[PDB]
Design a protein around this nucleic acid. Structure first.
Length: 131
RNA sequence: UCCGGAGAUGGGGUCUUAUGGCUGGAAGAGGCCAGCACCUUUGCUGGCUCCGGUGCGCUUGUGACGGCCCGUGAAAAUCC
């Protein structure tokens, strides 16, 4: 249950120019294969494209400035949970708490007894919560 | 190297007049000649100004296409 916090993407930074999945699409509709639009329709299309561009810019900026605040709040909640678990001193949760602290510590300012192995366990080799 | 049961090939028609042809303007104009007048603005007269070819040529306009980039590629006056 407590291992799901290990999968928080908001507490991860990857390489600034990571390669994503190969996506191929037509860059633009071909000029000779366009649909006829009236002058009023073409002017409306220009206007709505101008609106859409600025909406996209504003949404990008808002998402950027909200991700950091959400990251701060989630960091506070996660660290409070981890520290309260440690103060409670539960013998069956120490390894996960230490692994989470090691993973998300730099974001701040026994396998038989557990079930449902963590997501991407084939690639996420446990740094502190080893078998 | 694209089109055709989303109707090809074939047969018969409709349209835009861009651009060519003939004519009016217009030969009376302009051009090239010859001849005859005068101490002078010193101008009068008569002919011919026609028929063609050629283009990986230069300049320019235009038509149907093809490729690439891209907000379907400035706005308004104005006319229909």
């Amino acid at each position: 249950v407590l291992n799901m916090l290990l999968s928080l993407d908001v507490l991860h930074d990857y390489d600034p120019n990571t390669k994503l999945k190969g996506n191929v699409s037509a860059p633009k509709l071909k000029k000779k294969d366009r649909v006829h639009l009236s002058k009023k329709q073409r002017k409306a299309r220009k206007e709505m494209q101008q609106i859409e561009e600025e909406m996209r810019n504003a949404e990008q900026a808002v998402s950027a400035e909200e991700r950091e605040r959400n990251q701060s709040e989630i960091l506070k909640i996660v660290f409070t949970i981890y520290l309260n678990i440690l103060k409670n001193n539960a013998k069956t949760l120490i390894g996960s708490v230490l692994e989470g602290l090691t993973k998300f510590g730099n974001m701040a300012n026994y396998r038989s007894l557990r079930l449902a192995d963590p997501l991407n366990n084939e690639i996420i080799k446990p740094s502190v919560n080893v078998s």
